[PDB]
Scaffold this active site. Structure first.
Site, mmCIF file in Angstrom:
data_model
loop_
_atom_site.group_PDB
_atom_site.id
_atom_site.type_symbol
_atom_site.label_atom_id
_atom_site.label_comp_id
_atom_site.label_asym_id
_atom_site.label_seq_id
_atom_site.Cartn_x
_atom_site.Cartn_y
_atom_site.Cartn_z
ATOM 1 N N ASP A 1 -12.718 10.054 -8.865
ATOM 2 C CA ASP A 1 -13.803 10.349 -7.953
ATOM 3 C C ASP A 1 -13.462 11.415 -6.917
ATOM 4 O OD1 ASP A 1 -12.127 8.981 -6.202
ATOM 5 O OD2 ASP A 1 -13.553 7.425 -5.698
ATOM 6 N N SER B 1 -11.340 11.462 -4.568
ATOM 7 C CA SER B 1 -10.994 10.955 -3.231
ATOM 8 C C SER B 1 -9.485 10.816 -3.097
ATOM 9 C CB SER B 1 -11.647 9.587 -2.958
ATOM 10 O OG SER B 1 -11.107 8.559 -3.773
ATOM 11 N N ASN C 1 -7.114 10.249 -6.292
ATOM 12 C CA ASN C 1 -7.850 9.482 -7.290
ATOM 13 C C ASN C 1 -8.626 10.520 -8.111
ATOM 14 O OD1 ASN C 1 -7.253 6.855 -5.831
ATOM 15 N ND2 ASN C 1 -8.602 7.767 -4.295
ATOM 16 N N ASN D 1 -9.053 5.107 2.133
ATOM 17 C CA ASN D 1 -9.763 6.028 1.265
ATOM 18 C C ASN D 1 -10.805 6.947 1.900
ATOM 19 O OD1 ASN D 1 -12.032 6.457 -1.064
ATOM 20 N ND2 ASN D 1 -9.939 6.606 -1.827
ATOM 21 N N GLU E 1 0.787 -1.227 0.000
ATOM 22 C CA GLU E 1 0.000 0.000 0.000
ATOM 23 C C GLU E 1 0.822 1.281 0.000
ATOM 24 O OE1 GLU E 1 -3.138 0.477 -0.685
ATOM 25 O OE2 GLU E 1 -3.789 -1.598 -0.518
ATOM 26 N N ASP F 1 -6.228 8.583 -0.897
ATOM 27 C CA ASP F 1 -5.819 7.458 -0.061
ATOM 28 C C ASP F 1 -4.753 7.965 0.891
ATOM 29 O OD1 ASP F 1 -7.328 5.362 -1.489
ATOM 30 O OD2 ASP F 1 -5.921 5.777 -3.128
#
Ligand code: NA
Length: 130
Positions: free
Chosen positions: A49, A51, A46, A60, A35, A53
């Site tokens: 959308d 968003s 991202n 998220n 990750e 992380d």
């Protein structure tokens, strides 16, 4: 902070992650490794959308933490996403636990399914004294 392998292994253990809802330390290590490469400051926007992380587990903002800039998302961990960028991973660990309490468990992370599930992960905790 970019953790060294064994340092993180013990940190997660001290935080009650070993066997949490049946998840071994090795599965958590493999997750964090893929990750963020054990990096607490890791972030990935991202564009699709809007968003982001956050942290060592790349949690998220769409559903898990609040950052205010994600158009009408949710905050299941009831934490500011900023808490996921602390050197101290207790808040992130708390959120990771919340995530796995759902049906899917650790499968919520696509990277775990692809890079950890049904794999020999012993190497993540070998020599760590955990
Ligand atoms: Na396990």
């Amino acid at each position: 902070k970019v953790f060294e392998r064994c340092e993180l292994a013990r940190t997660l253990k001290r935080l009650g992650m070993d066997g949490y809802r049946g998840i071994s330390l090795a599965n958590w290590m493999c997750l964090a490794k893929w990750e963020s490469g054990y990096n607490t400051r890791a972030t990935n926007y991202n564009a699709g959308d809007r968003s982001t992380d956050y942290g060592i587990f790349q949690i998220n903002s769409r559903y898990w933490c609040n950052d205010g800039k994600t158009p009408g998302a949710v905050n299941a961990c009831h934490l500011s996403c900023s808490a996921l960028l602390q050197d101290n991973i207790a808040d992130a660990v708390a959120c990771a636990k919340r995530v796995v309490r759902d049906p899917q468990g650790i499968r919520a992370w696509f990277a775990w399914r692809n890079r950890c599930q049904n794999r020999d992960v012993r190497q993540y905790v070998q020599g760590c004294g955990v």
